[PDB]
Design a binder for these strands. Sequence first.
DNA 1: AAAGATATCTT
DNA 2: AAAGATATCTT
Lengths: 244, 244
Amino acid sequence: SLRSDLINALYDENQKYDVCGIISAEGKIYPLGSDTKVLSTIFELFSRPIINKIAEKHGYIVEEPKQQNHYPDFTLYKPSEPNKKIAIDIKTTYTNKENEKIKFTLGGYTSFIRNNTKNIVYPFDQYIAHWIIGYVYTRVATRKSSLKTYNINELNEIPKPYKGVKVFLQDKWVIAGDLAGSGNTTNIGSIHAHYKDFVEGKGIFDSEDEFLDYWRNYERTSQLRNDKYNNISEYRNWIYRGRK
Amino acid sequence: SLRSDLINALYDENQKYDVCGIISAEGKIYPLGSDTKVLSTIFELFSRPIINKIAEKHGYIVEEPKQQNHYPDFTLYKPSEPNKKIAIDIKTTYTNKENEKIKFTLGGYTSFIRNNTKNIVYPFDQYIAHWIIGYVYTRVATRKSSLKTYNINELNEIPKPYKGVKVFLQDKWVIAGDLAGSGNTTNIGSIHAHYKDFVEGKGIFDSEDEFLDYWRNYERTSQLRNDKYNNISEYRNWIYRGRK
DNA sequence: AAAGATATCTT
DNA sequence: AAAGATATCTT
């Protein structure tokens, strides 16, 4: 299927290629920096060709946003099936050591999930799937990156800002947690777990319907949350009480 | 001076080189996307070797943040004078057609300017200068060709996501404005003007001390600013009356 | 944890 | 404009 083909293509491409710099039209190469600010950008760009190739192979049109603060990174759909759109978002995070627990920010909880057309390319109801392509990289111990330029002959001598990279594709609701991923920017937080758990989808919500109800009624501050719910257990008790 | 040389080098490099993609150690090239999240990263990386080259020529050490989310992008200082550090931050914004008005977000107003060691590499009082290297690019619409990978022999064929790029170097206080650049993320806003005004330094503050005082006492919401000041005129009247 | 940093945009 | 979106991190 589209999903299985995309997952195979992602593993393969990632296992074969290692990004090491930005290149100019004149052939001069500039090395990469250490921060996720740099790496999330690199992984977004690395993924575009893969996604588009697999999508074409299945008769899916691929669209990127026009406005810069609009979700998702990629909207896939067949012209004949306008209400069966697939949303793909690329998310990045790091680990200092290979077997540590990681977590992702999974998007705002006050935008499109509460208002059908807010900050989203197409109305939220036109999407039948929301996939997360997550990249996890291990930072290198050296805090000092290279500050000189290179040429094509020196590609093998350019130091990489990451030690290793792992990728996965998974439905957003399956990996969503019950604690916010950010405060002032009100993001949904993912489960705090090992890479394997994201791959296998060991989440906390019983369904996508529960995931949505939880995040649509989550309060912004703990003060407001204390009289409602602060976690999954409390949310379920809140349902029992009659949503009050 | 360090400053004249740095801007001559940036201006020169920008005219002779055009970034067109990221490259893998295997020689595969991936095209660039058209949003600022992407170009901001590219311009940061493009600037690094130039800043380091010019700094070394003048005997300065160049240091990048050891921790993420710490200002500034580059800290320059002579070993013999640790308390006269220079902060350089790279900022990017876009324009839809050349010669329109632009504005930048100039960093937070509730972190290091109010608390000497908050989110900054070295205590704020050890910096004698805060320079902003600003990049302005004219946005260009993404085409189908940008969604495939390329080879080294095709560098000149890869489409660029920008039509033109202008660069300037100026002191932060000089180009700082009196209105916030963001709400929930409390950023200082720059003057809203044409590129030449940034190069020339036609700002609104009379001194760096006025700039600091204004932003150290700027309230976070218009409700709270109502009885204090919302702009430079009201701030000056407020100062005239005894800060009441 | 929760709250508020990092950079920049949109209406 | 002011306020709150986009992604992610740290204390």
